[PDB]
Structure 1
Amino acid sequence: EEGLDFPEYDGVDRVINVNAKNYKNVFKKYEVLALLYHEPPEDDKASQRQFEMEELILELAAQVLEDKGVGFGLVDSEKDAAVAKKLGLTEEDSIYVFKEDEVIEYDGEFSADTLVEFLLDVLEDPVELIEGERELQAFENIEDEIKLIGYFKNKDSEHYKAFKEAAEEFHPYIPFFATFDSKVAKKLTLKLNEIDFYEAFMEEPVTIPDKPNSEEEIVNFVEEHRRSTLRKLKPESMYETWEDDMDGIHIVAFAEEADPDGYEFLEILKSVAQDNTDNPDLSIIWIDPDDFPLLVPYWEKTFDIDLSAPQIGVVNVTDADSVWMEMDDEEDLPSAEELEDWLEDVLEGEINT
């Protein structure tokens, strides 16, 4: 009796060298396939070590997800240029995820935790059905992401099928929910074939106009409303969010949700968002420092702030130059009006509008 060990990385290689000769068979073997499209090995040790680490991160994810039929592979942009073309791999050192007839160009954190969570989400069906109270309550409780909900006759409705096709386009980043139950639709205030879009952190939805909606109408609407006034930086999508800057800058708020002050600040931020939701020139990024433990020292040093307290600032995406609002913690946090006033002062002395 020694006592069984927790699972451990076993050092067995599972990541596939995907090439011209095997790529068709690889796609046949796995229902979900994650492929790292990468540049060939440079001569310097630094580059080789960076690649070595990325590959092992994939190995860890591959071990974890082996039983679930998720495969992992490498496509060398030189040795495997032809495979890349056929598959549409363009972005250097980027992960592409394949499920059925969909390709996803992953733009999140390169970590085993984040990748595994993402791929488990990918494996799920694209539409969540609401039948019970638990499920409806779960839907109502979602705030930190855009969500859509539609009421349809049944799974065979042409309009449900269009909704599902649209859901697949954004899977798994934007949750699509459906109900076939008139009582549920009643509580959600949905007419038949009506689809309500809830912007992140917004209480009131916007109904997609011109129902019943084609797949294209839904996709167009979501794309047009893709950027919420307040959005959360999430590991699974951090790079896409950060690269979607507001003319060279982001307004960035740090708030630890689990902390009393961080929670209060978040409620204030939500008020600011709600009061300015119609302004297309405004996006605030909420970062919870608890979600990014490896970046906290860097942020505290770079921005010269204490992340144990709520913060709000404006960051220049070009050089990481920034300015942060002074808040005395011996008094109440600034009100929504005060935050808006400060943002106006900072941004009025700028290059636009």
Structure 2
Amino acid sequence: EGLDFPEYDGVDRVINVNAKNYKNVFKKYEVLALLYHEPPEDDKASQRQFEMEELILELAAQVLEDKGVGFGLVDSEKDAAVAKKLGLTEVDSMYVFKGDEVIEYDGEFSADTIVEFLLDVLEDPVELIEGERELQAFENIEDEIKLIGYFKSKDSEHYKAFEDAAEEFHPYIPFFATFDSKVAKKLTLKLNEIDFYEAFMEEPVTIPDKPNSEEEIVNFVEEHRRSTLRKLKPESMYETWEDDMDGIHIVAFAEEADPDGFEFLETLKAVAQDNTENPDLSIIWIDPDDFPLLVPYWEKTFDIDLSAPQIGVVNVTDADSVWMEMDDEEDLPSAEELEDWLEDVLEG
């Protein structure tokens, strides 16, 4: 008899966090994920929706039990006093507490993404570059903002300020550091210098006025928080989509694992690089392979075939959209053709 794969065991591990136990709960767990939620309305549908959300947390709780991650619920009415003491303000959101750090979760509510997120939370906020493999891994990061600094040692005042700033964006924005002058020469970094890499960009921008305090780094990252080309990721999809440019998003569908999707993606990078100075411009790359449960909805709402690359303009108010025509029997449009089509659409 072969041993079974792991399965959900039906044992309840999600804690009802209330005024009587919330102090004891925070002492038991190093990392604690709390769902701050309104009580479900009396209709059956609202109870089923909450029933689903709680079981998703139960699954994540079973997977992360051995690593010491706790899961809890905070009722916005029954536990209003707990919400005030913990700083839980945005209802129906999940808050992650890692010691004396509070991390808000801005992603899809599924066991997959929540578990991957919390595993990232558990890691140290700064990743150290020592060997060639670590340096090569840093250079190959392109689908997200990244920062790298060169400091004298882990005990440098300027590294500790860099580490304090990394905790503010943990674990969404990767922070990298080196204390090796050879690695710093390969990255063209002076001592206490921090290079900021916009997503999908080759040239970094140096944070000015080095050495940088924690506040200088935090102010710089927030000011450059929106890259010209951004990828929609499950762990941060709601944050990205709410940062629209005056009510619209330019949306591009491209399956990276597909040869046409890959070619179209390389064109999108060229478009973004050629317009990287434009502050208002926001292009969102969606890989439909990352969101299989939304593909039927997207194909119906936008009247497009996601088996092929697509690009359009979406109105965030009503989901009204317009999508560029592309005939697959010929070459995909060049960056010049894409820029031309976007100009005419946006001119209206």
Distance in 2 separating the partners of 1:184 and 1:100: 32
- Aligned position for 1:179: 178
SS state at 1:9 partner: coil
Q: Identity over aligned residues, as a percent?
A: 97
Distance in 2 separating the partners of 1:311 and 1:197: 30
Deviations 1:316-344 (A, max 9, x none): 00000000000111111100011001000
Distance in 1 separating the partners of 2:132 and 2:97: 33
Deviations 1:259-286 (A, max 9, x none): 0000000000000000000101101000
Displacement of 1:44 in angstroms is 0.2
Displacement of 1:223 in angstroms is 0.2
SS state at 2:244 partner: coil
Distance in 1 separating the partners of 2:92 and 2:169: 22
SS state at 1:261 partner: helix
Distance in 2 separating the partners of 1:279 and 1:50: 42
Paired positions, count: 348
Query: Runs of 5+ in structure 2 lacking a partner?
Result: none
Displacement of 1:90 in angstroms is 1.1
- Aligned position for 1:320: 319
Displacement of 1:105 in angstroms is 1.4
User: After the TM superposition, which of the residue ranges 239-248 and 95-104 deviates more from structure 2?
Assistant: 95-104
Distance in 1 separating the partners of 2:305 and 2:42: 40
TM-score (norm: length of structure 1): 0.98
SS state at 1:318 partner: coil
- Aligned position for 1:192: 191
SS state at 2:65 partner: helix
Distance in 2 separating the partners of 1:307 and 1:12: 40
Deviations 1:14-66 (A, max 9, x none): 00000001101111111111000011131100000000000000000000000
Deviations 1:201-253 (A, max 9, x none): 00000000000000000000000000000000000000000011110000000
Distance in 2 separating the partners of 1:229 and 1:29: 43
- Aligned position for 1:272: 271
SS state at 1:96 partner: strand
Distance in 2 separating the partners of 1:332 and 1:66: 51
Distance in 2 separating the partners of 1:155 and 1:107: 31
* RMSD of aligned alpha carbons: 0.4
Deviations 1:51-107 (A, max 9, x none): 000000000000000000000000000000000000111111110111122111111
Distance in 1 separating the partners of 2:181 and 2:135: 13
Query: Runs of 5+ in structure 1 lacking a partner?
Result: none
SS state at 1:67 partner: coil
Deviations 1:300-323 (A, max 9, x none): 000000000000000000000000
Displacement of 1:178 in angstroms is 0.1
Distance in 1 separating the partners of 2:197 and 2:99: 28
Deviations 1:135-170 (A, max 9, x none): 000000000000000000000000000000000000
Distance in 2 separating the partners of 1:250 and 1:334: 20
SS state at 2:81 partner: helix
TM-score (norm: length of structure 2): 1.00
Distance in 2 separating the partners of 1:85 and 1:310: 47
Distance in 2 separating the partners of 1:270 and 1:41: 44
Distance in 1 separating the partners of 2:21 and 2:339: 57
Distance in 2 separating the partners of 1:250 and 1:11: 42
Distance in 2 separating the partners of 1:204 and 1:346: 30
Distance in 2 separating the partners of 1:182 and 1:166: 22
Distance in 1 separating the partners of 2:213 and 2:283: 31
User: After the TM superposition, which of the residue ranges 84-93 and 221-230 deviates more from structure 2?
Assistant: 84-93
- Aligned position for 1:146: 145
Deviations 1:166-187 (A, max 9, x none): 0000000000000000000000
SS state at 2:188 partner: coil
Matched, 1:20 2:16: no
Q: Map 1:70-81 to 2 at 5 A.
A: 70-81=69-80
SS state at 2:285 partner: strand
- Aligned position for 2:228: 229
Distance in 1 separating the partners of 2:266 and 2:99: 40
Deviations 1:102-133 (A, max 9, x none): 11111100000000000000000000000000
Matched, 1:282 2:281: yes
Distance in 2 separating the partners of 1:98 and 1:201: 31
- Aligned position for 1:169: 168
SS state at 1:72 partner: strand
Structure 1 outlier segments of 4+, above 4 Å: none
Distance in 2 separating the partners of 1:101 and 1:29: 14
